[PDB]
Design a protein around this motif. Structure first.
Motif, PDB file in Angstrom:
ATOM      1  N   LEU A   1      39.962  25.737  50.780  1.00 19.87           N
ATOM      2  CA  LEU A   1      38.791  25.682  49.739  1.00 19.87           C
ATOM      3  C   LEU A   1      38.808  26.987  49.022  1.00 19.87           C
ATOM      4  CD1 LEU A   1      36.508  24.493  48.284  1.00 19.87           C
ATOM      5  CD2 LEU A   1      35.063  25.022  50.372  1.00 19.87           C
ATOM      6  N   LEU A   2      38.799  28.221  49.581  1.00 15.48           N
ATOM      7  CA  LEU A   2      38.611  29.375  48.896  1.00 15.48           C
ATOM      8  C   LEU A   2      39.719  29.596  48.110  1.00 15.48           C
ATOM      9  CD1 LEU A   2      37.050  31.907  51.356  1.00 15.48           C
ATOM     10  CD2 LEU A   2      36.056  30.257  49.905  1.00 15.48           C
ATOM     11  N   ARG A   3      40.849  29.176  48.568  1.00 16.33           N
ATOM     12  CA  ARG A   3      42.236  29.630  47.786  1.00 16.33           C
ATOM     13  C   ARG A   3      41.955  28.786  46.205  1.00 16.33           C
ATOM     14  NH1 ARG A   3      46.159  28.267  51.483  1.00 16.33           N
ATOM     15  NH2 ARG A   3      45.759  30.450  52.133  1.00 16.33           N
ATOM     16  N   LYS A   4      41.844  27.490  46.300  1.00 18.90           N
ATOM     17  CA  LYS A   4      41.500  26.381  45.279  1.00 18.90           C
ATOM     18  C   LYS A   4      40.410  27.227  44.590  1.00 18.90           C
ATOM     19  CE  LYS A   4      39.925  21.670  43.992  1.00 18.90           C
ATOM     20  NZ  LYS A   4      39.741  20.298  44.556  1.00 18.90           N
TER      21      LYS A   4
ATOM     22  N   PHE B   1      41.012  39.866  40.694  1.00 24.53           N
ATOM     23  CA  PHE B   1      41.387  38.689  41.453  1.00 24.53           C
ATOM     24  C   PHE B   1      42.527  38.944  42.319  1.00 24.53           C
ATOM     25  CE2 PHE B   1      38.987  36.557  37.822  1.00 24.53           C
ATOM     26  CZ  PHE B   1      38.049  35.716  38.514  1.00 24.53           C
ATOM     27  N   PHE B   2      43.241  39.756  42.035  1.00 25.32           N
ATOM     28  CA  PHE B   2      44.324  40.074  42.803  1.00 25.32           C
ATOM     29  C   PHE B   2      44.033  40.660  44.490  1.00 25.32           C
ATOM     30  CE2 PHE B   2      47.862  43.115  44.829  1.00 25.32           C
ATOM     31  CZ  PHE B   2      48.964  42.055  44.911  1.00 25.32           C
ATOM     32  N   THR B   3      43.105  41.912  44.305  1.00 33.00           N
ATOM     33  CA  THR B   3      42.596  42.036  45.435  1.00 33.00           C
ATOM     34  C   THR B   3      41.873  41.012  46.338  1.00 33.00           C
ATOM     35  OG1 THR B   3      42.351  44.329  44.557  1.00 33.00           O
ATOM     36  CG2 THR B   3      40.732  43.941  46.497  1.00 33.00           C
ATOM     37  N   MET B   4      41.065  40.399  45.804  1.00 22.73           N
ATOM     38  CA  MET B   4      40.469  38.989  46.284  1.00 22.73           C
ATOM     39  C   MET B   4      41.497  37.960  47.044  1.00 22.73           C
ATOM     40  SD  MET B   4      37.351  37.977  44.127  1.00 22.73           S
ATOM     41  CE  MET B   4      36.689  36.660  45.401  1.00 22.73           C
ATOM     42  N   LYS B   5      42.603  37.888  46.216  1.00 22.45           N
ATOM     43  CA  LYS B   5      43.920  37.080  46.865  1.00 22.45           C
ATOM     44  C   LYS B   5      44.490  37.779  48.101  1.00 22.45           C
ATOM     45  CE  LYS B   5      46.608  33.741  46.630  1.00 22.45           C
ATOM     46  NZ  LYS B   5      46.786  32.565  47.584  1.00 22.45           N
ATOM     47  N   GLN B   6      44.532  39.049  48.011  1.00 26.58           N
ATOM     48  CA  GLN B   6      44.933  39.964  49.302  1.00 26.58           C
ATOM     49  C   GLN B   6      43.873  39.658  50.366  1.00 26.58           C
ATOM     50  OE1 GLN B   6      45.582  43.888  47.431  1.00 26.58           O
ATOM     51  NE2 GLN B   6      47.580  43.536  48.003  1.00 26.58           N
ATOM     52  N   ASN B   7      42.754  39.834  50.003  1.00 27.09           N
ATOM     53  CA  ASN B   7      41.549  39.779  51.251  1.00 27.09           C
ATOM     54  C   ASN B   7      41.601  38.272  51.778  1.00 27.09           C
ATOM     55  OD1 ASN B   7      40.969  42.491  50.647  1.00 27.09           O
ATOM     56  ND2 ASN B   7      39.009  41.732  49.365  1.00 27.09           N
ATOM     57  N   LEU B   8      41.703  37.250  50.841  1.00 26.98           N
ATOM     58  CA  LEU B   8      41.574  35.832  51.313  1.00 26.98           C
ATOM     59  C   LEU B   8      42.967  35.692  52.461  1.00 26.98           C
ATOM     60  CD1 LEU B   8      40.877  33.110  51.269  1.00 26.98           C
ATOM     61  CD2 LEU B   8      41.891  32.845  49.094  1.00 26.98           C
ATOM     62  N   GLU B   9      44.235  36.320  52.006  1.00 26.18           N
ATOM     63  CA  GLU B   9      45.150  35.796  52.988  1.00 26.18           C
ATOM     64  C   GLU B   9      45.391  36.927  54.015  1.00 26.18           C
ATOM     65  OE1 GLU B   9      46.539  33.319  52.260  1.00 26.18           O
ATOM     66  OE2 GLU B   9      46.203  32.920  50.269  1.00 26.18           O
ATOM     67  N   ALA B  10      44.458  37.902  54.150  1.00 24.40           N
ATOM     68  CA  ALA B  10      44.374  38.894  55.317  1.00 24.40           C
ATOM     69  C   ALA B  10      43.119  38.198  56.228  1.00 24.40           C
ATOM     70  CB  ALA B  10      44.209  40.171  54.686  1.00 24.40           C
ATOM     71  N   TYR B  11      42.774  37.068  55.886  1.00 19.14           N
ATOM     72  CA  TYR B  11      41.362  36.521  56.815  1.00 19.14           C
ATOM     73  C   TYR B  11      40.341  37.362  56.702  1.00 19.14           C
ATOM     74  CZ  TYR B  11      45.636  33.858  58.385  1.00 19.14           C
ATOM     75  OH  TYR B  11      46.869  33.235  58.467  1.00 19.14           O
ATOM     76  N   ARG B  12      39.853  38.016  55.422  1.00 17.94           N
ATOM     77  CA  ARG B  12      38.970  38.868  55.390  1.00 17.94           C
ATOM     78  C   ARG B  12      37.655  38.044  54.740  1.00 17.94           C
ATOM     79  NH1 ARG B  12      42.702  43.007  53.074  1.00 17.94           N
ATOM     80  NH2 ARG B  12      43.274  44.143  54.816  1.00 17.94           N
ATOM     81  N   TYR B  13      37.857  36.887  54.396  1.00 17.00           N
ATOM     82  CA  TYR B  13      36.688  36.117  53.972  1.00 17.00           C
ATOM     83  C   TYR B  13      36.721  34.742  54.790  1.00 17.00           C
ATOM     84  CZ  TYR B  13      37.439  38.299  49.318  1.00 17.00           C
ATOM     85  OH  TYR B  13      37.488  39.247  48.317  1.00 17.00           O
TER      86      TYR B  13
ATOM     87  N   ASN C   1      33.184  33.633  55.402  1.00 15.79           N
ATOM     88  CA  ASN C   1      32.003  32.696  54.944  1.00 15.79           C
ATOM     89  C   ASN C   1      32.209  32.876  53.554  1.00 15.79           C
ATOM     90  OD1 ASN C   1      30.156  35.146  54.071  1.00 15.79           O
ATOM     91  ND2 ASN C   1      30.560  35.670  56.125  1.00 15.79           N
ATOM     92  N   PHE C   2      31.481  31.633  52.834  1.00 14.43           N
ATOM     93  CA  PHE C   2      31.493  31.583  51.371  1.00 14.43           C
ATOM     94  C   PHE C   2      30.833  32.771  50.818  1.00 14.43           C
ATOM     95  CE2 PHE C   2      32.051  28.447  48.237  1.00 14.43           C
ATOM     96  CZ  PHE C   2      31.333  28.846  47.210  1.00 14.43           C
ATOM     97  N   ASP C   3      29.733  33.185  51.229  1.00 12.53           N
ATOM     98  CA  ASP C   3      28.719  34.397  50.557  1.00 12.53           C
ATOM     99  C   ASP C   3      29.653  35.715  50.378  1.00 12.53           C
ATOM    100  OD1 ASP C   3      27.050  32.564  50.313  1.00 12.53           O
ATOM    101  OD2 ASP C   3      25.316  33.684  51.493  1.00 12.53           O
ATOM    102  N   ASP C   4      30.704  36.025  51.360  1.00 12.22           N
ATOM    103  CA  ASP C   4      31.618  37.195  51.176  1.00 12.22           C
ATOM    104  C   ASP C   4      32.459  37.005  50.048  1.00 12.22           C
ATOM    105  OD1 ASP C   4      30.399  38.688  53.330  1.00 12.22           O
ATOM    106  OD2 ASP C   4      31.910  38.452  54.660  1.00 12.22           O
ATOM    107  N   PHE C   5      33.094  35.831  49.832  1.00  9.10           N
ATOM    108  CA  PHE C   5      33.882  35.524  48.792  1.00  9.10           C
ATOM    109  C   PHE C   5      33.220  35.743  47.625  1.00  9.10           C
ATOM    110  CE2 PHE C   5      35.631  32.152  46.120  1.00  9.10           C
ATOM    111  CZ  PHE C   5      37.030  32.515  45.920  1.00  9.10           C
ATOM    112  N   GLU C   6      31.996  35.123  47.624  1.00 11.04           N
ATOM    113  CA  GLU C   6      31.199  35.164  46.136  1.00 11.04           C
ATOM    114  C   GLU C   6      30.917  36.454  45.787  1.00 11.04           C
ATOM    115  OE1 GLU C   6      27.046  33.377  44.454  1.00 11.04           O
ATOM    116  OE2 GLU C   6      27.063  33.745  46.617  1.00 11.04           O
ATOM    117  N   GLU C   7      30.420  37.355  46.701  1.00 12.79           N
ATOM    118  CA  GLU C   7      30.087  38.764  46.565  1.00 12.79           C
ATOM    119  C   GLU C   7      31.121  39.522  45.942  1.00 12.79           C
ATOM    120  OE1 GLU C   7      29.351  40.809  50.171  1.00 12.79           O
ATOM    121  OE2 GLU C   7      28.294  42.654  49.262  1.00 12.79           O
ATOM    122  N   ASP C   8      32.387  39.164  46.406  1.00 11.85           N
ATOM    123  CA  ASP C   8      33.404  40.081  45.617  1.00 11.85           C
ATOM    124  C   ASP C   8      33.710  39.358  44.187  1.00 11.85           C
ATOM    125  OD1 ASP C   8      33.937  41.836  47.413  1.00 11.85           O
ATOM    126  OD2 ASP C   8      35.687  40.961  48.200  1.00 11.85           O
TER     127      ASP C   8
END
Ligand SMILES: [K+]
Ligand SMILES: [K+]
Ligand SMILES: [K+]
Ligand SMILES: [K+]
Length: 116
Positions: free
Chosen positions: A12-15, A51-63, A65-72
């Protein structure tokens, strides 16, 4: 909640990240602001984001919960409003992206809520 599973949440976060990038049609926020070209950027901005940094964080399991993703995502917009003058295209593009990305995030949040 206790029923939410890691893999469906990360898909869901990747999409959602792809949908938010699709709204940045200018490709303004694709990559970090280059400090060699904008040397006063960190005088104003304490936590750069893109957005590149957010993709790195996503694939490193740093998100996880939904609100940490939204915050970035919100930090991408807020940093652009902070740095750039109100009369600039960049400032007005960030206001637009906040509006269009807010709508993407509301639909994505309903999908997260249905995971329990
Ligand atoms: K884009
Ligand atoms: K910016
Ligand atoms: K404005
Ligand atoms: K705004």
């Amino acid at each position: 909640g206790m029923e939410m599973q890691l893999t469906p949440f990360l898909i869901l976060l990747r999409k959602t990240l792809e949908q938010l990038q699709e709204k940045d049609t200018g490709n303004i926020f694709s990559e970090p602001v280059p400090l060699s070209e904008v040397p006063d950027y960190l005088d104003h901005i304490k936590k750069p984001m893109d957005f590149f940094t957010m993709k790195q964080n996503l694939e490193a399991y740093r998100y996880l919960n939904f609100d940490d993703f939204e915050e970035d995502f919100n930090l991408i917009v807020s940093n652009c409003l902070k740095y750039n003058a109100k009369d600039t295209i960049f400032y007005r593009a960030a206001v637009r992206l906040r509006e269009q990305g807010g709508a993407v995030l509301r639909q994505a949040r309903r999908q997260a809520e249905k995971m329990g």
